[PDB]
Design an enzyme around this catalytic site. Sequence first.
Site, short mmCIF file in Angstrom:
data_model
loop_
_atom_site.label_atom_id
_atom_site.label_comp_id
_atom_site.label_asym_id
_atom_site.label_seq_id
_atom_site.Cartn_x
_atom_site.Cartn_y
_atom_site.Cartn_z
CG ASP A 30 -0.44 0.47 2.46
OD1 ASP A 30 0.46 -0.22 3.00
OD2 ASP A 30 -0.89 1.57 2.90
CG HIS A 47 -0.42 1.78 -8.86
ND1 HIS A 47 -0.70 0.98 -7.77
CD2 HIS A 47 -1.32 2.79 -8.83
CE1 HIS A 47 -1.73 1.48 -7.11
NE2 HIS A 47 -2.13 2.59 -7.75
CG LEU A 141 9.42 -17.26 -3.86
CD1 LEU A 141 9.40 -17.27 -2.34
CD2 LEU A 141 9.90 -15.92 -4.36
#
Lengths: 244, 244
Positions: A30, A47, A141
């Site tokens: 955020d 973004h 991962l």
Amino acid sequence: PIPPQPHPSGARPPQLPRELIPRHVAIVMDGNGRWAKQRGLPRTEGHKAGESSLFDVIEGALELGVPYLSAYAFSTENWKRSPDEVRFLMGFNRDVIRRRRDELHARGVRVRWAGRPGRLWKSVIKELTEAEELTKHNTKLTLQFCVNYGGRAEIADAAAALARDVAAGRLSPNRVTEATLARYLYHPDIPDVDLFIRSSGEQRLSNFLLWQSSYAEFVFLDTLWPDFDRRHFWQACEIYARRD
Amino acid sequence: EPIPPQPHPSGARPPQLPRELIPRHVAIVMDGNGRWAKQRGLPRTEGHKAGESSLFDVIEGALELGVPYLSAYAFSTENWKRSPDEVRFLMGFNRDVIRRRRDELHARGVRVRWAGRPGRLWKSVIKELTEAEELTKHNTKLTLQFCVNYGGRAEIADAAAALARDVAAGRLSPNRVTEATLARYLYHPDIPDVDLFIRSSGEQRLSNFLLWQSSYAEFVFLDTLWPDFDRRHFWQACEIYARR
């Protein structure tokens, strides 16, 4: 697997005992908006910066040996934002996956899409679906890439799927327990969240991996997501370790 | 006609906050009973005894400020960190507390709602909780969700189980299962979302408390050990919530 590129700063992963390294880290990314306002940039630039943040944190996870990383990429809360912001976020999260697919396959990253198709563009669903297929044998991962996701929605979808098996006589209603419901989550082979990182000052779950985060350690940092990189991830892991 | 709350010995008064910024539902985890006793060279059980006065003062604080819903994590089922003797004490204690205080609570217009499983709880604990529920069931000034033998995952699983019984009996379609459907099967569906989640001690975790209901809640982590915690700390947490 091709090794992770080290940080420009030359910072190295902390030497922690394997027993104290979190198996599963969840990150709410955020402050893309807030970051842009502070630097007089448009919200879209925040973004754009956030893309490099995620990919640096993935490197940090590979370097340190964290096998599960969950990222809140697109919350169903985004449907409350303007049509133009939602149009940008769909196109962006699609383009990010398309651009970085091959880098992730190479580094042994398995991409798992967690969320609902719902009102996503068919092009977004396509990229996510293809990224899942390409990477489904990797094991170094697991990136749980949460797009059009909510924790309550996931639990409700689990209860709905459980209900179909009960209706069809495959499951008894008196054998419905925590472990039963857990089998019907989006990715039941992904374990509990050990460490829940909230990048910015806002101290909330925000409906993210709700079931999975029940016993997680919360770490609330001050860094907005575009300024976040593997060193902030590592700091959060160190805080986690010191809590033992 | 409810009897008013006794004001604090300090003469401290509730903060003047706009009604719109006062949390409708506050949830509290009561941590640090043990640590507080260790500091004073007392056995851990004496901390729990001291915590009784903390809970009752916080309830007064909720009445003074006009918070209509207060949830307290009195007894978790998963006492995995605690000794058999401390668990045995905590069952008896939470029973004795509800016996000793039900009339004070009735008088102040507090409705007691027991959230949790009958499970392996003593008949004597269930009895006191059940009688407190019956006695107070018409009060409306404050709802105290007294969570005894409770867990967030357990409550969601029990909801899914009850939903599953209705599906098996043909009372409900399995393709009509949504967030709103599952929410109707929680222990107390009429109790709304947690607005503010207060964790008394330094430990920054949900610890499996009102999981579904805390999805969008604000977390406030204080330093105060629970026996030192009173309405002023509750009020501080509500001030931090408003200033957000």
